[PDB]
Short mmCIF file of C-alpha atoms and ligand atoms in Angstrom, two decimals:
data_model
loop_
_atom_site.label_atom_id
_atom_site.label_comp_id
_atom_site.label_asym_id
_atom_site.label_seq_id
_atom_site.Cartn_x
_atom_site.Cartn_y
_atom_site.Cartn_z
CA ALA A 1 43.91 196.48 151.80
CA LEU A 2 44.81 196.39 148.10
CA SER A 3 46.11 192.82 148.30
CA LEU A 4 42.97 191.08 149.55
CA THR A 5 41.62 187.99 147.75
CA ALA A 6 37.88 188.21 146.88
CA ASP A 7 37.17 185.55 149.53
CA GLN A 8 39.22 187.50 152.07
CA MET A 9 37.26 190.61 151.09
CA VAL A 10 33.90 188.95 151.74
CA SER A 11 34.58 187.58 155.24
CA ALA A 12 36.30 190.84 156.14
CA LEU A 13 33.08 192.70 155.38
CA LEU A 14 31.06 189.91 157.01
CA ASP A 15 33.00 190.14 160.28
CA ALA A 16 32.74 193.93 160.20
CA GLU A 17 28.94 193.76 160.27
CA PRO A 18 27.32 195.89 162.99
CA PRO A 19 24.83 194.23 165.35
CA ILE A 20 21.06 194.48 165.02
CA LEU A 21 19.86 196.86 167.73
CA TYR A 22 16.45 196.75 169.41
CA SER A 23 13.85 199.49 169.77
CA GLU A 24 11.86 200.80 172.73
CA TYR A 25 8.44 199.92 171.31
CA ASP A 26 5.62 199.15 173.74
CA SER A 27 1.40 208.91 168.19
CA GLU A 28 3.55 210.58 165.54
CA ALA A 29 5.85 212.03 168.20
CA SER A 30 6.49 208.58 169.68
CA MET A 31 6.98 206.81 166.35
CA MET A 32 9.54 209.39 165.26
CA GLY A 33 11.04 209.16 168.74
CA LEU A 34 11.61 205.43 168.28
CA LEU A 35 13.25 205.95 164.89
CA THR A 36 15.44 208.91 165.88
CA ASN A 37 16.62 207.06 168.99
CA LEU A 38 17.26 203.84 167.08
CA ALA A 39 19.15 205.57 164.27
CA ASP A 40 21.23 207.55 166.77
CA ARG A 41 22.39 204.34 168.44
CA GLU A 42 22.99 202.72 165.05
CA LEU A 43 25.20 205.63 164.00
CA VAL A 44 27.68 204.71 166.72
CA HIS A 45 28.12 201.18 165.35
CA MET A 46 28.20 202.41 161.74
CA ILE A 47 31.23 204.56 162.56
CA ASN A 48 33.10 201.56 163.97
CA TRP A 49 31.86 199.43 161.08
CA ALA A 50 33.25 201.96 158.60
CA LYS A 51 36.73 201.70 160.12
CA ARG A 52 36.72 197.93 159.61
CA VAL A 53 35.87 198.46 155.95
CA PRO A 54 39.12 197.88 153.99
CA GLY A 55 40.80 201.08 152.81
CA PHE A 56 38.64 203.45 154.83
CA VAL A 57 41.20 203.97 157.60
CA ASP A 58 43.84 204.71 154.96
CA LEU A 59 41.94 207.91 154.16
CA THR A 60 42.38 211.14 156.11
CA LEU A 61 40.16 212.06 159.06
CA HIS A 62 38.53 214.78 156.97
CA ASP A 63 37.73 212.35 154.14
CA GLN A 64 36.34 209.81 156.61
CA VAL A 65 33.99 212.43 158.05
CA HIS A 66 32.85 213.56 154.60
CA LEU A 67 31.94 210.08 153.36
CA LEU A 68 29.90 209.19 156.45
CA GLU A 69 28.08 212.53 156.55
CA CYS A 70 26.90 212.00 152.97
CA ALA A 71 26.13 208.28 153.19
CA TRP A 72 24.91 207.69 156.76
CA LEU A 73 21.20 207.63 155.86
CA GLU A 74 21.85 205.56 152.74
CA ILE A 75 23.62 202.91 154.81
CA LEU A 76 20.81 202.92 157.38
CA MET A 77 18.26 202.52 154.60
CA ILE A 78 19.96 199.65 152.77
CA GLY A 79 20.35 197.94 156.15
CA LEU A 80 16.64 198.31 156.88
CA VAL A 81 15.80 197.17 153.35
CA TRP A 82 18.02 194.08 153.69
CA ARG A 83 16.59 193.14 157.09
CA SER A 84 13.06 193.54 155.72
CA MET A 85 13.67 191.22 152.76
CA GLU A 86 11.84 188.27 154.34
CA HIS A 87 8.99 190.48 155.56
CA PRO A 88 6.78 191.56 152.61
CA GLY A 89 4.76 194.72 153.20
CA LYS A 90 6.67 195.50 156.39
CA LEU A 91 9.85 197.33 157.39
CA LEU A 92 12.01 195.62 160.02
CA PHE A 93 13.49 198.65 161.79
CA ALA A 94 14.19 196.36 164.73
CA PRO A 95 13.29 192.77 165.76
CA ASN A 96 10.72 194.33 168.10
CA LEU A 97 9.70 197.04 165.64
CA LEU A 98 8.08 195.66 162.49
CA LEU A 99 6.19 198.57 160.92
CA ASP A 100 3.39 198.21 158.38
CA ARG A 101 2.80 200.64 155.49
CA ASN A 102 -0.45 201.73 157.18
CA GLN A 103 1.54 202.36 160.35
CA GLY A 104 3.71 204.71 158.31
CA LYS A 105 0.73 207.03 157.87
CA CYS A 106 1.04 207.87 161.57
CA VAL A 107 3.64 210.44 160.51
CA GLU A 108 2.73 212.87 157.73
CA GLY A 109 5.12 212.58 154.78
CA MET A 110 6.56 209.31 156.06
CA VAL A 111 4.28 206.93 154.16
CA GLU A 112 5.75 208.03 150.81
CA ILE A 113 9.20 207.09 152.12
CA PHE A 114 7.87 203.81 153.51
CA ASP A 115 6.57 202.91 150.04
CA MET A 116 9.97 203.54 148.45
CA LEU A 117 11.65 201.44 151.13
CA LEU A 118 9.13 198.63 150.69
CA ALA A 119 9.68 198.63 146.92
CA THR A 120 13.45 198.46 147.35
CA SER A 121 13.04 195.56 149.78
CA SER A 122 10.67 193.85 147.36
CA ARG A 123 13.22 194.37 144.58
CA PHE A 124 15.93 192.72 146.68
CA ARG A 125 13.71 189.69 147.27
CA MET A 126 12.89 189.33 143.58
CA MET A 127 16.62 189.36 142.83
CA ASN A 128 17.20 187.07 145.82
CA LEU A 129 19.99 189.29 147.16
CA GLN A 130 22.72 187.35 148.94
CA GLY A 131 24.28 188.54 152.20
CA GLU A 132 27.74 188.52 150.64
CA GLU A 133 26.42 190.86 147.94
CA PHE A 134 24.72 193.07 150.52
CA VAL A 135 27.87 193.82 152.52
CA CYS A 136 29.61 194.63 149.23
CA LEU A 137 26.89 197.07 148.19
CA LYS A 138 26.83 198.72 151.62
CA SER A 139 30.60 199.23 151.45
CA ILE A 140 30.27 200.68 147.95
CA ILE A 141 27.75 203.22 149.25
CA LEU A 142 30.25 204.29 151.91
CA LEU A 143 33.03 204.88 149.38
CA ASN A 144 30.99 206.21 146.45
CA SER A 145 28.39 208.58 147.90
CA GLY A 146 30.95 211.31 148.58
CA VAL A 147 33.99 210.44 146.47
CA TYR A 148 33.33 213.14 143.86
CA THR A 149 32.31 215.87 146.30
CA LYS A 150 41.09 209.90 145.32
CA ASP A 151 42.70 207.20 143.18
CA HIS A 152 42.90 204.96 146.25
CA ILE A 153 39.13 204.96 146.80
CA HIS A 154 38.35 203.96 143.22
CA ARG A 155 41.10 201.35 143.47
CA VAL A 156 39.24 199.86 146.44
CA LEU A 157 35.87 200.19 144.69
CA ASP A 158 37.28 198.17 141.80
CA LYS A 159 38.28 195.43 144.23
CA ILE A 160 34.73 195.34 145.58
CA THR A 161 33.54 195.11 141.97
CA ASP A 162 35.90 192.17 141.43
CA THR A 163 34.44 190.61 144.57
CA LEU A 164 30.85 190.89 143.35
CA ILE A 165 31.84 189.26 140.06
CA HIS A 166 33.67 186.57 142.03
CA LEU A 167 30.50 185.91 144.03
CA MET A 168 28.27 185.65 140.96
CA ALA A 169 30.79 183.48 139.11
CA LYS A 170 31.03 180.91 141.90
CA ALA A 171 27.23 181.06 142.11
CA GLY A 172 27.29 179.32 138.72
CA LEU A 173 26.11 182.27 136.65
CA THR A 174 27.36 182.72 133.08
CA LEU A 175 29.54 185.80 132.49
CA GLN A 176 26.72 187.50 130.60
CA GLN A 177 24.61 186.92 133.71
CA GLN A 178 27.43 188.22 135.91
CA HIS A 179 27.59 191.59 134.15
CA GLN A 180 23.80 191.89 134.07
CA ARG A 181 23.34 191.14 137.77
CA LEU A 182 26.21 193.48 138.63
CA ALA A 183 24.44 196.25 136.72
CA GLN A 184 21.09 195.55 138.37
CA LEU A 185 22.56 195.82 141.88
CA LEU A 186 24.40 199.09 141.25
CA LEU A 187 21.36 200.68 139.60
CA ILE A 188 19.45 200.04 142.82
CA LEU A 189 21.97 202.26 144.62
CA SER A 190 20.65 205.16 142.53
CA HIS A 191 17.19 204.64 144.04
CA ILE A 192 18.73 204.32 147.50
CA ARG A 193 20.36 207.71 147.02
CA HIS A 194 16.95 208.99 145.95
CA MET A 195 15.25 207.68 149.09
CA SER A 196 18.04 209.24 151.14
CA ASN A 197 17.61 212.69 149.59
CA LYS A 198 13.85 212.49 150.08
CA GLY A 199 14.25 211.08 153.58
CA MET A 200 16.74 213.79 154.49
CA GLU A 201 14.35 216.51 153.32
CA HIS A 202 11.65 214.89 155.45
CA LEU A 203 13.98 214.83 158.46
CA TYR A 204 14.87 218.50 158.00
CA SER A 205 11.15 219.29 158.20
CA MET A 206 10.99 217.45 161.53
CA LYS A 207 13.66 219.85 162.83
CA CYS A 208 10.72 222.29 162.74
CA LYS A 209 9.75 222.33 166.45
CA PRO A 210 13.20 213.86 170.51
CA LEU A 211 16.28 214.55 168.37
CA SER A 212 19.86 213.87 169.50
CA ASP A 213 23.02 215.91 168.90
CA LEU A 214 24.95 213.49 166.68
CA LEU A 215 21.88 213.05 164.49
CA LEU A 216 21.62 216.83 164.16
CA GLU A 217 25.18 217.16 162.87
CA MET A 218 24.45 214.39 160.36
CA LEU A 219 21.38 216.38 159.29
CA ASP A 220 23.22 219.71 159.32
CA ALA A 221 25.90 218.20 157.06
CA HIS A 222 23.41 218.34 154.18
CA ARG A 223 22.82 222.06 154.80
CA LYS B 1 31.97 217.61 165.25
CA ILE B 2 30.91 214.53 167.22
CA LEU B 3 31.59 212.30 164.21
CA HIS B 4 35.21 213.44 163.99
CA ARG B 5 35.70 212.65 167.68
CA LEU B 6 33.98 209.26 167.49
CA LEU B 7 36.29 208.47 164.58
CA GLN B 8 39.09 209.11 167.09
CA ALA C 1 13.70 195.77 120.92
CA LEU C 2 15.20 192.67 122.53
CA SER C 3 16.07 191.10 119.17
CA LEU C 4 18.46 193.98 118.53
CA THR C 5 22.18 193.25 118.22
CA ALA C 6 24.68 195.15 120.37
CA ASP C 7 25.89 197.12 117.35
CA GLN C 8 22.29 197.71 116.26
CA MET C 9 21.47 198.97 119.75
CA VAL C 10 24.32 201.49 119.66
CA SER C 11 23.25 202.75 116.24
CA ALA C 12 19.62 203.04 117.34
CA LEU C 13 20.59 205.17 120.35
CA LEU C 14 23.00 207.33 118.34
CA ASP C 15 20.39 208.06 115.68
CA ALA C 16 17.93 208.97 118.45
CA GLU C 17 20.16 211.73 119.86
CA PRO C 18 18.38 215.08 120.33
CA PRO C 19 19.82 218.27 118.79
CA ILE C 20 22.01 220.75 120.64
CA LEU C 21 19.86 223.85 121.06
CA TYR C 22 20.99 227.46 121.42
CA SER C 23 20.07 230.09 124.00
CA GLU C 24 18.40 233.48 123.56
CA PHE C 25 23.91 238.72 133.98
CA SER C 26 21.33 239.02 136.76
CA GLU C 27 19.29 236.48 138.73
CA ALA C 28 16.12 236.94 136.68
CA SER C 29 17.98 237.11 133.36
CA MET C 30 20.06 233.93 133.64
CA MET C 31 17.14 232.00 135.14
CA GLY C 32 15.11 233.25 132.19
CA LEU C 33 17.67 231.85 129.77
CA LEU C 34 17.90 228.49 131.54
CA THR C 35 14.16 227.93 131.94
CA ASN C 36 13.62 228.87 128.30
CA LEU C 37 16.37 226.47 127.22
CA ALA C 38 15.12 223.66 129.46
CA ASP C 39 11.53 224.07 128.17
CA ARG C 40 12.69 223.72 124.57
CA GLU C 41 14.99 220.76 125.28
CA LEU C 42 12.15 218.95 127.07
CA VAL C 43 10.20 218.83 123.81
CA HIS C 44 13.12 217.09 122.11
CA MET C 45 13.69 214.79 125.10
CA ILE C 46 10.15 213.43 124.80
CA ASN C 47 10.64 212.63 121.12
CA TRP C 48 14.07 211.17 121.88
CA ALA C 49 12.55 208.86 124.50
CA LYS C 50 10.12 207.51 121.90
CA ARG C 51 13.11 206.59 119.74
CA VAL C 52 14.66 204.60 122.58
CA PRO C 53 14.29 200.83 121.95
CA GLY C 54 11.50 199.33 124.06
CA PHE C 55 10.15 202.65 125.31
CA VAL C 56 7.22 202.68 122.88
CA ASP C 57 6.32 199.19 124.08
CA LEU C 58 5.45 200.76 127.43
CA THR C 59 2.00 202.14 128.22
CA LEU C 60 1.35 205.88 128.06
CA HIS C 61 1.11 205.91 131.86
CA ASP C 62 4.52 204.28 132.31
CA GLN C 63 6.10 206.52 129.67
CA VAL C 64 4.88 209.57 131.58
CA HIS C 65 6.17 208.26 134.92
CA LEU C 66 9.66 207.54 133.57
CA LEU C 67 9.99 210.99 132.01
CA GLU C 68 8.57 212.82 135.04
CA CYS C 69 11.14 211.20 137.32
CA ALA C 70 14.19 211.34 135.04
CA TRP C 71 13.77 214.58 133.06
CA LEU C 72 16.25 216.60 135.13
CA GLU C 73 18.74 213.73 135.31
CA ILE C 74 18.62 213.49 131.52
CA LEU C 75 19.13 217.25 131.14
CA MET C 76 22.09 217.11 133.51
CA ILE C 77 23.89 214.12 131.99
CA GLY C 78 23.48 215.85 128.64
CA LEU C 79 24.94 219.07 130.03
CA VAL C 80 27.73 217.16 131.77
CA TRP C 81 28.57 215.30 128.55
CA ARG C 82 28.72 218.48 126.46
CA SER C 83 30.88 220.13 129.12
CA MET C 84 33.59 217.45 128.93
CA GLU C 85 35.82 219.25 126.43
CA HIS C 86 35.30 222.48 128.37
CA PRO C 87 37.08 222.04 131.74
CA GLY C 88 35.89 224.33 134.53
CA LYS C 89 32.93 225.37 132.40
CA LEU C 90 29.37 224.22 131.69
CA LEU C 91 27.97 224.14 128.16
CA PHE C 92 24.21 224.66 128.45
CA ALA C 93 24.29 225.94 124.88
CA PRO C 94 27.03 226.72 122.33
CA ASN C 95 26.28 230.41 122.91
CA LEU C 96 25.94 229.84 126.65
CA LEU C 97 29.14 228.51 128.23
CA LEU C 98 29.18 229.31 131.95
CA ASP C 99 31.81 229.00 134.68
CA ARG C 100 31.17 228.49 138.41
CA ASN C 101 31.43 232.19 139.29
CA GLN C 102 28.65 233.01 136.84
CA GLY C 103 26.57 230.63 138.95
CA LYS C 104 26.71 233.08 141.85
CA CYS C 105 24.28 235.30 139.94
CA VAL C 106 21.43 233.06 141.06
CA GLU C 107 21.14 232.31 144.78
CA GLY C 108 21.85 228.66 145.54
CA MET C 109 22.93 227.69 142.03
CA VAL C 110 26.71 227.66 142.47
CA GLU C 111 26.39 224.53 144.63
CA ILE C 112 24.65 222.78 141.75
CA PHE C 113 27.30 224.01 139.31
CA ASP C 114 30.12 222.56 141.43
CA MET C 115 28.44 219.15 141.42
CA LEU C 116 27.91 219.36 137.66
CA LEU C 117 31.51 220.43 137.04
CA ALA C 118 32.65 217.51 139.20
CA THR C 119 30.69 215.00 137.11
CA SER C 120 32.12 216.38 133.86
CA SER C 121 35.67 216.18 135.20
CA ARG C 122 34.91 212.63 136.31
CA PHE C 123 33.67 211.86 132.79
CA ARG C 124 36.88 213.23 131.29
CA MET C 125 38.94 211.29 133.84
CA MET C 126 37.30 208.10 132.58
CA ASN C 127 37.48 209.28 128.96
CA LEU C 128 33.78 208.56 128.44
CA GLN C 129 32.86 207.64 124.87
CA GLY C 130 29.76 208.82 123.02
CA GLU C 131 28.65 205.22 122.57
CA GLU C 132 28.76 204.84 126.35
CA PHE C 133 26.98 208.13 127.04
CA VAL C 134 23.91 207.29 124.96
CA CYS C 135 23.65 204.02 126.87
CA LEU C 136 23.88 205.73 130.26
CA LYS C 137 21.27 208.32 129.31
CA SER C 138 18.91 205.56 128.15
CA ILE C 139 19.53 203.64 131.37
CA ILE C 140 18.59 206.74 133.37
CA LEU C 141 15.31 207.05 131.45
CA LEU C 142 14.26 203.47 132.18
CA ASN C 143 15.70 202.98 135.67
CA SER C 144 14.93 206.19 137.58
CA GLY C 145 11.21 205.53 137.99
CA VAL C 146 11.05 201.75 137.70
CA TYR C 147 10.53 201.31 141.49
CA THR C 148 7.95 204.04 141.99
CA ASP C 149 9.74 193.31 133.93
CA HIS C 150 9.92 194.47 130.31
CA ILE C 151 11.95 197.49 131.42
CA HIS C 152 14.47 195.39 133.35
CA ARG C 153 15.22 193.19 130.33
CA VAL C 154 15.76 196.26 128.16
CA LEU C 155 18.14 197.46 130.88
CA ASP C 156 19.93 194.11 130.69
CA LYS C 157 20.20 194.61 126.93
CA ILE C 158 21.87 197.99 127.40
CA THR C 159 24.19 196.36 129.93
CA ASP C 160 25.10 193.80 127.27
CA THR C 161 25.55 196.77 124.94
CA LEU C 162 27.92 198.55 127.34
CA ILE C 163 30.10 195.46 127.81
CA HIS C 164 30.17 194.87 124.04
CA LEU C 165 31.58 198.37 123.56
CA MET C 166 34.28 197.82 126.18
CA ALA C 167 35.21 194.41 124.78
CA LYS C 168 35.53 196.11 121.39
CA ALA C 169 37.91 198.74 122.79
CA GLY C 170 40.38 196.03 123.81
CA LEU C 171 39.51 196.05 127.51
CA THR C 172 40.24 192.78 129.32
CA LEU C 173 37.53 190.83 131.15
CA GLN C 174 38.46 192.37 134.50
CA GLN C 175 38.68 195.86 132.99
CA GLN C 176 35.23 195.41 131.44
CA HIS C 177 33.08 194.86 134.53
CA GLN C 178 35.26 197.27 136.50
CA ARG C 179 34.52 200.08 134.05
CA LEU C 180 30.84 199.10 133.94
CA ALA C 181 30.66 199.58 137.71
CA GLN C 182 32.44 202.94 137.67
CA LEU C 183 30.00 204.23 135.04
CA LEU C 184 26.83 203.15 136.84
CA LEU C 185 28.04 204.50 140.18
CA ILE C 186 28.20 207.97 138.62
CA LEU C 187 24.46 207.63 138.01
CA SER C 188 24.07 207.66 141.79
CA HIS C 189 25.67 211.11 141.82
CA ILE C 190 23.57 212.27 138.86
CA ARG C 191 20.45 211.30 140.80
CA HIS C 192 21.82 213.27 143.75
CA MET C 193 22.39 216.40 141.67
CA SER C 194 18.86 216.09 140.29
CA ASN C 195 17.29 215.94 143.75
CA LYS C 196 19.28 218.99 144.88
CA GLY C 197 18.51 220.70 141.58
CA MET C 198 14.82 219.86 141.83
CA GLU C 199 14.57 221.42 145.29
CA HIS C 200 16.36 224.54 144.04
CA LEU C 201 13.90 225.03 141.18
CA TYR C 202 11.04 224.71 143.66
CA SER C 203 12.58 227.47 145.76
CA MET C 204 12.87 229.63 142.65
CA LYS C 205 9.18 228.94 142.09
CA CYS C 206 8.32 230.03 145.63
CA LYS C 207 10.47 233.13 145.20
CA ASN C 208 8.89 233.78 141.80
CA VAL C 209 12.21 234.72 140.19
CA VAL C 210 11.00 233.90 136.68
CA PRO C 211 7.61 232.59 135.48
CA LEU C 212 8.09 228.94 134.53
CA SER C 213 6.30 227.36 131.57
CA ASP C 214 3.28 225.18 132.32
CA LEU C 215 5.17 222.15 131.02
CA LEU C 216 8.19 222.85 133.21
CA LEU C 217 5.85 223.30 136.17
CA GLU C 218 4.11 219.99 135.49
CA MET C 219 7.47 218.20 135.38
CA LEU C 220 8.36 220.00 138.61
CA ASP C 221 5.05 219.24 140.32
CA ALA C 222 5.53 215.55 139.56
CA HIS C 223 8.09 215.54 142.38
CA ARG C 224 6.26 217.88 144.76
CA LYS D 1 -1.15 216.83 131.46
CA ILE D 2 0.85 218.49 128.68
CA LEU D 3 3.27 215.55 128.80
CA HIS D 4 0.42 213.38 127.52
CA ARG D 5 -0.11 215.29 124.27
CA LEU D 6 3.61 215.56 123.51
CA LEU D 7 4.05 211.80 123.93
CA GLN D 8 1.25 211.34 121.40
O1 LIG E 1 10.08 208.98 157.59
C1 LIG E 1 11.36 208.44 157.42
C2 LIG E 1 12.42 209.27 157.12
C3 LIG E 1 13.69 208.74 156.95
C4 LIG E 1 13.90 207.38 157.07
O2 LIG E 1 15.20 206.88 156.88
C5 LIG E 1 15.56 205.84 157.76
S1 LIG E 1 15.91 204.25 157.34
C6 LIG E 1 16.27 203.57 158.84
C7 LIG E 1 16.65 202.29 159.28
C8 LIG E 1 16.88 202.06 160.64
O3 LIG E 1 17.26 200.78 161.08
C9 LIG E 1 16.75 203.10 161.56
C10 LIG E 1 16.38 204.37 161.13
C11 LIG E 1 16.14 204.60 159.76
C12 LIG E 1 15.74 205.89 159.16
C13 LIG E 1 15.55 207.13 159.99
C14 LIG E 1 14.29 207.45 160.49
C15 LIG E 1 14.12 208.59 161.26
C16 LIG E 1 15.20 209.41 161.53
F1 LIG E 1 15.04 210.51 162.27
C17 LIG E 1 16.46 209.09 161.04
C18 LIG E 1 16.63 207.95 160.27
C19 LIG E 1 12.84 206.54 157.36
C20 LIG E 1 11.57 207.07 157.54
O1 LIG E 2 20.04 226.04 139.48
C1 LIG E 2 19.93 224.92 138.65
C2 LIG E 2 18.84 224.08 138.78
C3 LIG E 2 18.73 222.97 137.96
C4 LIG E 2 19.69 222.70 137.00
O2 LIG E 2 19.54 221.55 136.20
C5 LIG E 2 19.69 221.73 134.81
S1 LIG E 2 20.82 220.93 133.85
C6 LIG E 2 20.46 221.55 132.31
C7 LIG E 2 20.99 221.35 131.03
C8 LIG E 2 20.45 222.05 129.94
O3 LIG E 2 20.98 221.85 128.66
C9 LIG E 2 19.39 222.94 130.14
C10 LIG E 2 18.87 223.14 131.41
C11 LIG E 2 19.41 222.44 132.51
C12 LIG E 2 18.96 222.54 133.92
C13 LIG E 2 17.83 223.45 134.33
C14 LIG E 2 18.08 224.76 134.69
C15 LIG E 2 17.03 225.59 135.06
C16 LIG E 2 15.73 225.11 135.06
F1 LIG E 2 14.72 225.91 135.42
C17 LIG E 2 15.48 223.80 134.69
C18 LIG E 2 16.53 222.97 134.33
C19 LIG E 2 20.79 223.54 136.87
C20 LIG E 2 20.91 224.65 137.69
#
């Protein structure tokens, strides 16, 4: 895991990619029902995706649980944002569930989150985010969101950093451009954390009188 | 925890 | 602001640094000290922001938005930075150095303290330099609200400034962008602490522990 | 907003 070439790192993360699941789309209670159900099924694949992420299995069971509990919504969000890149003004939750901003108003307090997600997606498109960069960022989120809450984890994070630089270098960018683009991508993760905290607080308010068990434990993990 | 079990 | 050299950028940020203020244990008492301290620091933060290169080039509206979103992050990264040489303790003020058990005085504050103590220990583990800190704090000011083009090129300038510092310290090319990443990833945690800290202050408001200043309430209402 | 006056 610590002896992977940047190219080997990329395709490893590329092969580890979870599938794109469909919805049950044909009411605020139904819209939330579609999202809760979809996320609950996505959580199963995220867990198996996390294990295929280099270095993650080297951690203890406790540490694996901690990282996922803190980052699960972040990973879901950056996935949604990446899928929605080619769909301006819309969030591609699923190939059969393309939600508009105005459709977000169906649930009170959801539209503000939709706007943040749309902006993040718009930001990705402006930067022309590459898929190889996306899987790197998503893996960073997994290892960083709960690391300071091991020297091996940061040693893996550095390798992912090397990979991102390797991607930008071969893309023809000057080294000044490499460091700048690297910074721009990682600063987006701060806003993704922000959307997650806001989204989590919104979810906790929906636990106030169609929610699964696994999703509850993921919600309960944030007290 | 379901997560801990799903992580085998 | 974009014509500034890397060295000239560092000097500009250093000169812009706000002063370290002093303070004036029960739940109401400590909260009283913190809210008083935060209200006074906020006045210096605003004037510090105006001394940040490229920030005055922004409209009044955009200046307000950036400060409303980042004000707690800026307070925290300042606190975390001052607490570096004080392991296991938090330096809100030179006459107010608190440990985690003194955080149990206020309900739901010890969780915030543990996150803050963790960031300071992480800073010491990386041996964060003052030249790097002023860059990070300026990045927070400009980035935190940018998604809710001039700003992004000032950010790029600070990125060039961060690398220039690392290249000066004898760090190799690989060590440079590796350290840059590690620094910016901590900002993700600082944002996290802010969001948890912002919710806690709102609960203190609802519990009416201590009357907050109108300014502190306006900064708090900007998040709702 | 108070933040307005302080920025000016
Ligand atoms: O109102 C909200 C609140 C949280 C949200 O976070 C996200 S992002 C995303 C991407 C997916 O492919 C599937 C689900 C999600 C969610 C999500 C929505 C509702 C929920 F209960 C859990 C997660 C979204 C909208
Ligand atoms: O319970 C809390 C809530 C927010 C907190 O965020 C911070 S960091 C920091 C650094 C300072 O030099 C001065 C104040 C702060 C605060 C803060 C504490 C109380 C409050 F009402 C507003 C901000 C801390 C503890």
